[PDB]
Scaffold this active site. Structure first.
Site, short mmCIF file in Angstrom:
data_model
loop_
_atom_site.label_atom_id
_atom_site.label_comp_id
_atom_site.label_asym_id
_atom_site.label_seq_id
_atom_site.Cartn_x
_atom_site.Cartn_y
_atom_site.Cartn_z
CG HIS A 1 50.62 35.12 -39.83
ND1 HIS A 1 49.53 35.98 -39.90
CD2 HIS A 1 51.45 35.48 -40.84
CE1 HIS A 1 49.68 36.80 -40.92
NE2 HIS A 1 50.86 36.55 -41.50
CG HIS B 1 54.70 26.68 -38.25
ND1 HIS B 1 55.17 26.07 -39.40
CD2 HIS B 1 53.35 26.49 -38.22
CE1 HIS B 1 54.16 25.52 -40.06
NE2 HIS B 1 52.99 25.77 -39.36
CG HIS C 1 48.96 26.12 -36.32
ND1 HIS C 1 48.64 27.16 -37.18
CD2 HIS C 1 49.84 25.35 -36.95
CE1 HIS C 1 49.31 26.99 -38.35
NE2 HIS C 1 50.06 25.90 -38.21
CD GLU D 1 46.47 24.96 -38.49
OE1 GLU D 1 47.33 24.52 -39.23
OE2 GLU D 1 45.92 26.06 -38.68
CG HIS E 1 51.94 22.14 -38.74
ND1 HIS E 1 50.98 23.10 -39.04
CD2 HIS E 1 51.29 21.03 -38.31
CE1 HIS E 1 49.76 22.60 -38.85
NE2 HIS E 1 49.94 21.35 -38.39
CB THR F 1 46.70 25.09 -42.34
OG1 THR F 1 47.76 25.67 -41.55
CG2 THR F 1 46.73 23.58 -42.45
C1 LIG Z 1 53.79 29.82 -48.36
C2 LIG Z 1 54.80 30.07 -47.28
C3 LIG Z 1 56.02 30.49 -47.68
C4 LIG Z 1 56.87 30.71 -46.65
C5 LIG Z 1 58.24 31.20 -46.99
N1 LIG Z 1 56.61 30.46 -45.35
C6 LIG Z 1 55.40 30.02 -45.10
S1 LIG Z 1 55.16 29.82 -43.36
C7 LIG Z 1 54.08 28.42 -43.22
C8 LIG Z 1 53.00 28.52 -42.39
F1 LIG Z 1 52.77 29.64 -41.70
C9 LIG Z 1 52.16 27.44 -42.23
F2 LIG Z 1 51.21 27.62 -41.34
C10 LIG Z 1 52.36 26.22 -42.93
S2 LIG Z 1 51.36 24.79 -42.70
N2 LIG Z 1 50.40 24.98 -41.44
O1 LIG Z 1 52.30 23.76 -42.31
O2 LIG Z 1 50.64 24.55 -43.91
C11 LIG Z 1 53.46 26.17 -43.80
F3 LIG Z 1 53.67 25.07 -44.50
C12 LIG Z 1 54.26 27.31 -43.96
F4 LIG Z 1 55.35 27.30 -44.73
N3 LIG Z 1 54.44 29.83 -46.00
ZN LIG Z 2 51.16 25.04 -39.66
#
Ligand SMILES: Cc1cc(C)nc(Sc2c(F)c(F)c(S(N)(=O)=O)c(F)c2F)n1
Ligand SMILES: [Zn+2]
Ligand SMILES: Cc1cc(C)nc(Sc2c(F)c(F)c(S(N)(=O)=O)c(F)c2F)n1
Ligand code: NA
Length: 257
Positions: A61, A91, A93, A103, A116, A195
């Site tokens: 992703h 990470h 976007h 976002e 983020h 998100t």
């Molecule tokens: C629910 C979950 C569990 C784990 C282990 N990684 C993720 S990766 C992740 C992600 F891809 C996201 F886009 C976001 S975000 N945009 O900051 O809300 C996140 F918090 C994330 F932690 N998400």
């Molecule tokens: Zn994010």
């Protein structure tokens, strides 16, 4: 399953994840006129001196840099937060074009990308437990605009060719995330969600006012990543952002002005 294409993108997510239509979804547009200065907010405390990066991963992703969170090293506190939140990963976007990719938006302005930095509330013991609580996570959001290169980003940009495809990882030690911060820690804050699926409403969002500058060449390299796994049809990882969601009852607070 879920992704960012026409067939599995954000307008489809609610079918597997009904909280997609919930009352505290993210991202949102930040209307700078309607945000209220809250003189009771504290300055953020971003303490990344002892951060220990471990690995970089293409998760299909986005790509994420992961940290050792087995002790109190890199922590976010203060601001709107109660207690201590530990950095686990960051990470991004980003867009297929420089004029989209973030976002959150600011007065409907889209930035080229959004960083983020994800932190979890140490009162819940582990990241996984924190992901289930209403104040489990705090995500620090930083906008990227295209201009001058960000020197602190280049070590990340240069390793991306080693993680081109979904499920690839590489060692990524000794990366200092302080090099991704802007000068000012002025910020907006509001209660929201992940998100991406599962879209859980567990996030205190802290979005910095000042974007960082990255070069066109840096963001182009993000766009060479792939959503697909090795050996599968090549689909460029671009436009992996969710659009702004309804604010509903919520107030966005400003640390400044
Ligand atoms: C629910 C979950 C569990 C784990 C282990 N990684 C993720 S990766 C992740 C992600 F891809 C996201 F886009 C976001 S975000 N945009 O900051 O809300 C996140 F918090 C994330 F932690 N998400
Ligand atoms: Zn994010
Ligand atoms: C574009 C595409 C590719 C593949 C392999 N399966 C699907 S089926 C599908 C799916 F598996 C999903 F998880 C989702 S969703 N609600 O976006 O999570 C979807 F919409 C879908 F349409 N769609
Ligand atoms: Na963990």
């Amino acid at each position: 399953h879920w992704g960012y294409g026409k067939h599995n993108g954000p307008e489809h997510w609610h079918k597997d994840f009904p909280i997609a239509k919930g009352e505290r979804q993210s991202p949102v547009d930040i209307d700078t006129h309607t945000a209220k200065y809250d003189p009771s907010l504290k300055p953020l405390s971003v303490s990344y001196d002892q951060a220990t990066s471990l690995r970089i991963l293409n998760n299909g992703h986005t790509f994420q840099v992961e940290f050792d969170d087995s002790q109190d090293k890199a922590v976010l506190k203060g601001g709107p937060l109660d207690g201590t939140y530990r950095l686990i990963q960051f990470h991004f976007h980003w867009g297929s074009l420089d004029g989209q990719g973030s976002e959150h938006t600011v007065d409907k302005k889209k930035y080229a990308a959004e960083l983020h930095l994800v932190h979890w509330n140490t009162k819940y013991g582990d990241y996984g437990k924190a992901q289930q609580q209403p104040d489990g996570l705090a995500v620090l959001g930083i906008f990227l605009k295209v201009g001058s290169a960000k020197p602190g980003l280049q070590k990340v940009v240069d390793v991306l060719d080693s993680i081109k495809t979904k499920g690839k990882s590489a060692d990524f030690t000794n990366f200092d995330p302080r090099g991704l911060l802007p000068e000012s820690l002025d910020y907006w804050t509001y209660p929201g969600s992940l998100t991406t699926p599962p879209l859980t409403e567990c996030v205190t969002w802290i979005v910095l006012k000042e974007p960082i500058s990255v070069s066109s060449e840096q963001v182009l390299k993000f766009r060479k990543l792939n959503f697909n796994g090795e050996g599968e049809p090549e689909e460029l990882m671009v436009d992996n952002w969710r659009p702004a969601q309804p604010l509903k009852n919520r107030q966005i607070k400003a640390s400044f002005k």
